[PDB]
Each structure stands twice: as structure tokens, then as C-alpha cells.
Design a protein around this ligand. Structure first.
Ligand SMILES: NC(=O)c1ccc[n+]([C@@H]2O[C@H](COP(=O)([O-])OP(=O)(O)OC[C@H]3O[C@@H](n4cnc5c(N)ncnc54)[C@H](O)[C@@H]3O)[C@@H](O)[C@H]2O)c1
Lengths: 326, 327
């Protein structure tokens, strides 16, 4: 017999709520730092749809020789730039886990939600080890899906956070944002949002940089999720600069940090992985801004899908698909 | 909502019986010869299970801007060496098609049988244009999953084939092999005896080292080199003709003998089967020597067939609808 455990988005939600996604991110980062992950070359299939818009499929294979035991899988994310014009999320797709003995795909999960959850989980990990201690306010620029999942994980992992300071170039999206026990303060300008707290998360789809060093308080932190908001000078004047994977960043020079690396020396303190193993000393904000620039590692999604499937099995959630069908 | 049409193995089987898979392959090969496909580098994740057996996942993307509109998809095929030991087929996996407009996966299928079907359909195309005319016997080295699907298509496309000459290292597998109802199976005791018994060979093993010399082949012989490492280098060099699926694909995989030989120096490559179908190269049928067919395997053929199978399943009302969100 040949069976798939199919986990829909709502099942994956319920599994995430029942595990510690931040603990999982920390465990995979420590495995990655010790050379116990395999990240092969990605499958990339670009094309142009009937509209004339950029479409792609990205196939991201991943293995984690983890503390618990070995995990193997794939993250398949497809995107069309024209999707939001017709009322769809830009990206969608699916993840599989493989049986370590047979190599068979045994788990199939909707992946777009889990992808956003992983990004948010990494932010919480970064804040725990590199952020100010006891911060009670977080600032967002961009207030869509990614802001909602960030707010949810703030309630789980940072209960001192009572106030969210938000700005969105789409005013109506900002005024609709509620959070997850949070009071929301709408700001008229990005600057006013940044100045209102010690912790910024950028969640835009911007190509052009606009955030200077001067906006940040002494003793500040920025999670650079959207990757093109910060001006070159923020990186060079940073009290510290932490990445997820320096090679991933160098391989994507279309994002500002990758571009700066190509121009010469950039003061990268180290990786979040290296902090967690004790390879690099942690630097928390004191006199300046600490910058976190993660590109996003597929091994984290594979690791999170492994923990989600383990919870799904133990609580008997999901639906088993017969691949043969007699 | 975000919905998947799901096609299990036996549904794929049912659809294939009602379309022309060799015609689909031929169309996609002409689309690819014209440069109206996209065949990215295949993703590769290797590892070693606790038994110390070689394991792998292969993610193979493909696009076809062909004679049935633009089609996009992927084929995920995973294998463990140790699977036949514990009583499982060597290879298993799944395939997707993506919406041309939104890029969303809209079809999910079991793929190991589809993969076998595509391979056998390429063999049938190669024999039709490059094989002897009127052959009534075919030889197989290896009687696994590929051998069963090859037998089924021989019944559809070359009904004058009444005799199958087989050899397998596990004689128990060779004794269990029946082919289709129109076939008499002759079991031979060595590889050599199977080869010499006819003018048409299909190698369907898992070897990584060559063992077949030129001397075994009758004058006016054909070989479909599906297992890709059976033929010794001299077979290529002495060949009456040599046809490939895609030369650059082969060049980039020197793990397989023809890739190794091309890196080393000159090899007398006649052209591609795609080239024959478009008229870019002349066909050469066997006469005095052995015509060699060496296809590495192209994901665009899987994507092409899965689109034809999905279209048929809709009009037939087969397959089940899955919801990816769940509400
Ligand atoms: N060209 C392509 O596109 C393509 C695609 C799929 C399959 N293949 C290749 O074909 C093979 C898969 O065949 P399958 O799926 O039927 O595999 P399988 O494991 O089901 O069967 C292989 C059979 O070969 C036999 N065998 C192995 N070594 C042998 C030897 N030296 N002599 C004789 N018999 C031998 C085994 O006993 C077994 O019955 C692999 O090499 C696979 O990669 C090629």
C-alpha cells in the first residue's frame, strides 16, 4: 500500500498551536550551524502568463540530521505577480516529508501558511537572544498576513508586549489591523512608527530603500523580514549585524544586503545559529541598532513540517490518501 | 478556495487506456526540438538509511508551450536500493500541474506508474521510426516495473511481437513475468542468451557498470538503453547509428557511460529522436550493425502526459477533489 497523510492549512494551524515552533527553529539552526543540514540547488521554473506577468515554481529540497533524529522533505512555493490583481495571495504551494528508509513521500501539507509561521518563528528566536530584554512595544511597517502571524507569536513568546505601533502605505489596511492582548496605534508616517518603540519588523513588498540610521533609538533592534527597507548606512552603522545564512544572502544580490556584500566588506557580526551554539557572542542593543537580516531557510519549513506531522499523528489529525486506489 | 484534482495510480491507468501516450510523447519531443519547452536542472537530495542503503529524492520541473497550450508541472521521484528487499517497488512519488495564470498546483497524481508509462512510450516512438520493420520478438534484461509497462505498450503499438526473451539476476522475478495476453515469455539463463535471441533489446536493470559487448548483437539490431549503464563503450563507438533524447542533458550526467564518453572526447552521435520527428536529422533503421537509443529521461514528457491524463479524467469524471485550506 502507498499512503499520504494530507494536512490542509487549518490542520497545520491546529498542529502549530499545539507545538513550540520557536524551539523547533532554534533546534534546526543549531543543526545547520554544526553542518548537520543538506540544502541542494533549488529547482527554478520561470515563465510569463497570458497577462504578461512574472510566474515561477521554486522546488526547495532539505535534510536535517537533527538532535531528535533525521528528517528529509521538500518545500514547493509557486508565485504569480498578477495574483493580487485578481484577489489571490502572491504565493501558494505544498511541502512533503520523506520516509528515511523507503524515501517515499508520506506527508503532504499546504505550505504558504507554514512559510509565514516559520518567518515569524525566526523573528521571535532573534528577539529572545539578540533583542532588548523586557521590551513592551513592537513597531510594524506593513499590516497584512505576515503582521497578523507576528502579533500571534508575540502573545505566545513576549507577553510584556502590550502596544503595537503600525504604518502601512495602504492606510485602510493599517486601520483594519487588530493584533492578538495588544493595543494598536496607527501612525501617519513610517518614521513615527519606527521612533515609537525599540523593536521594528519590516513586512513590505518594497524595492526602494527608505529607512535611515537616524530613525532608530539608542538600544534598538530591527527584524528586516522584507529585506529592502533599510538604507545601506543602517548596515554600516549597525551596533551588530546578524544573518541566518551568509551564503544564501550573497547568492541573492537583488536584495540590498547581498548587493552591499558584492561591493566589498560589510560588518557582519555572525549568524543566529552561531549565537545559539556559542560560536559567536550575542550582542543585545545598548548604544545603537542591532540589525537582523534573514533571507529565509527552507530547512526550517522541513523541520517545522516534521514537528507538525508528529503532532497530527499523535492527535490523529489529517486525512490518509490511498495513492494506488485498488 | 484552493482545490486539487487527485489522481491515484489505478485512475492514471484507466485514463492512459483511453488516450494515445506515444502520440503525446512525439508531440512534446517536436515542441522540445523547436525550443518550445523549459527543462531546468533536476533537484537532487541523496542520503543513506540506517540499513546503509542509498536513498534519493529527485525534483524534476518541466514546461511545454506545445500543441495543447502552455503546461507547467513537476515530477517528484524517490527511490531506496533496499525497497525490493522489504517487498516494496524501488521507486515511488507524486506529480503536480500548475495553473498557467496563478502558478498554483491544481492537479496531484501518483507518478511512479506515469514515469514508467512515459519511458515505455518513448521506447515505442524510438522503435516506430528507428527500429527494424516487422520485428516479432523483443528481449528484456530485467523484469521489474519498467518491464511490465513496456510489455503492455508493445501489445498496443507492435502487436506482431508475440515472443519476449527475458533474463533477470533474480530468476524468481523472471519466472513470474507474464507480459500481456498476446505474449509468450521465453526465460533465458544468461544476459548473452536473451540478447542473441532477437533483433530488439531493452535494458531495464539498475547496474552502474557495463557488461554488454558489441559481439552479442545480431546484424540489423536495435537497443533501447533505458538503464543507461549496461552497454560497454565499444557498442557506442561501433554503432550503425546513435540517437539521444537531449545531448546537453546527457553531457551534464557523466555518472552514466555516454556522459563519460562525451567528456573524454568524440562520440558518433547521429542526433535526437526529436530531430528525426522534425526532420532536422534523417532516421537510420538497423541493417548491418546495431542502432543505439540512449534517452536520459526528460521531465517535460511526464508533464506533457500528466496534462493529457488530467484532461481525460475531467471529461471521464475520474479522480477526487481535495481542499488545501479546509476552513
Ligand atoms: N531513462 C529514463 O527516463 C528512466 C526512467 C525510469 C526508469 N529508468 C531506469 O530503469 C531502471 C528502473 O527499472 P524499474 O523501475 O523496473 O526497476 P525495478 O527495481 O522495479 O526493476 C529492476 C529489475 O532489474 C533486475 N536487475 C538488476 N540488476 C540486474 C542485472 N545486472 N541483470 C539483470 N537484471 C538485473 C532486478 O532484479 C529487478 O527485477 C533504473 O535503472 C531506472 O533509473 C530510466
Amino acid at each position: 500500500s502507498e499512503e499520504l497523510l494530507f494536512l490542509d492549512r487549518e490542520t497545520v494551524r491546529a498542529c502549530v498551536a499545539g507545538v513550540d515552533p520557536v524551539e523547533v527553529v532554534e533546534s534546526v539552526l543549531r543543526s545547520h550551524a554544526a553542518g548537520r543540514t543538506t540544502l541542494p540547488a533549488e529547482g527554478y521554473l520561470p515563465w510569463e502568463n497570458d497577462q504578461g506577468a512574472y510566474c515561477r515554481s521554486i522546488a526547495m529540497l532539505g535534510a536535517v540530521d537533527g538532535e531528535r533524529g533525521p528528517t528529509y522533505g521538500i518545500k514547493l512555493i509557486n508565485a504569480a505577480v498578477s495574483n493580487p490583481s485578481i484577489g489571490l495571495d502572491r504565493a501558494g504551494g505544498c511541502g512533503f516529508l520523506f520516509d528515511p528508509r523507503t524515501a517515499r513521500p508520506v506527508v503532504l501539507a499546504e505550505a504558504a501558511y507554514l512559510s509565514g509561521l516559520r518567518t515569524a518563528a525566526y523573528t521571535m528566536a532573534s528577539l529572545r537572544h539578540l533583542g532588548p530584554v523586557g521590551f513592551d512595544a513592537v513597531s510594524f511597517i506593513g499590516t497584512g498576513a505576515q503582521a497578523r502571524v507576528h502579533a500571534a507569536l508575540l502573545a505566545r513568546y513576549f507577553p510584556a508586549v502590550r502596544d503595537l505601533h503600525v504604518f502601512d502605505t495602504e492606510r485602510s489596511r493599517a486601520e483594519a489591523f487588530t493584533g492578538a492582548g495588544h493595543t494598536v496605534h496607527v501612525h501617519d508616517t513610517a518614521e513615527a512608527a519606527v521612533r515609537a518603540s525599540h523593536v521594528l519588523v519590516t513586512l513590505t513588498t518594497v524595492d526602494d530603500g527608505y529607512i535611515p540610521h537616524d530613525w532608530f533609538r539608542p538600544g534598538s533592534f530591527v527584524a528586516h523580514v522584507s529585506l529592502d527597507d533599510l538604507l545601506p548606512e543602517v548596515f554600516f552603522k549597525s551596533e551588530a549585524l546578524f544573518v541566518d545564512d551568509l551564503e544564501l544572502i550573497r547568492e541573492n544580490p537583488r536584495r540590498v544586503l547581498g548587493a552591499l556584500l558584492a561591493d566589498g566588506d560589510v560588518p557582519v557580526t555572525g549568524s543566529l545559529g552561531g549565537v545559539l551554539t556559542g560560536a559567536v557572542a550575542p550582542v543585545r542593543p545598548r548604544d545603537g541598532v542591532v540589525v537582523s537580516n534573514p533571507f529565509g531557510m527552507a530547512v526550517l519549513d522541513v523541520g517545522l513540517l516534521a514537528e507538525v506531522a508528529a503532532h497530527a499523528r499523535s492527535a490523529g489529525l489529517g486525512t490518509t490518501l490511498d495513492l494506488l486506489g485498488a
